[PDB]
Amino acid sequence: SMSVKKPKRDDSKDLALCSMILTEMETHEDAWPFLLPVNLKLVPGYKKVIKKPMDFSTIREKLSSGQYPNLETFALDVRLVFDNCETFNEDDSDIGRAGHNMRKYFEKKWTDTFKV
Numbered sequence: 476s477m478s479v480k481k482p483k484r485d486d487s488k489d490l491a492l493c494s495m496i497l498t499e500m501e502t503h504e505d506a507w508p509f510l511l512p513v514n515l516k517l518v519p520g521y522k523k524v525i526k527k528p529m530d531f532s533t534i535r536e537k538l539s540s541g542q543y544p545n546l547e548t549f550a551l552d553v554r555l556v557f558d559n560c561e562t563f564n565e566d567d568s569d570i571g572r573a574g575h576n577m578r579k580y581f582e583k584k585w586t587d588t589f590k591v
């Protein structure tokens with residue numbers, strides 16, 4: 476509260492580390508469904524069903540332009556990519572399984588990087 480400061484983790488490397496994690500995502504074999512926005516003009520239902528589209532290129536642009544205030548908001552957008560994928564694609568379709576694979580890949584990099 477006012478004048479009662481809680482010790483806070485050092486956040487000075489967060490931008491560089493989130494960029495490194497995002498680069499590992501972008502170069503993963505199964506990143507191809509997520510590198511670019513889903514084409515809202517070619518995919519029936521997507522714009523209507525998926526209220527907040529998100530993809531790696533948009534995350535990369537936002538990271539490169541100061542649009543993430545903290546690392547938690549970055550992880551929210553990454554997770555949004557895979558939540559969208561799981562809403563729209565069957566679990567064992569190629570895109571659907573890619574999404575499950577990429578979520579697991581991400582969460583392990585996240586804990587390995589930022590949990591101690």
Ligand SMILES: Cn1nc2c(c1NC(=O)[C@@H]1CCCN1S(=O)(=O)c1ccc(F)cc1)CCC2
Pocket residue numbers: 507508509510511512513514518560563564570
């Ligand atoms: C995440 N998500 N969820 C759904 C879809 C997708 N991703 C796509 O659409 C991506 C986005 C841009 C193009 N493509 S692509 O067609 O898949 C593609 C990508 C690389 C490549 F070399 C060949 C084809 C579509 C149906 C629902």
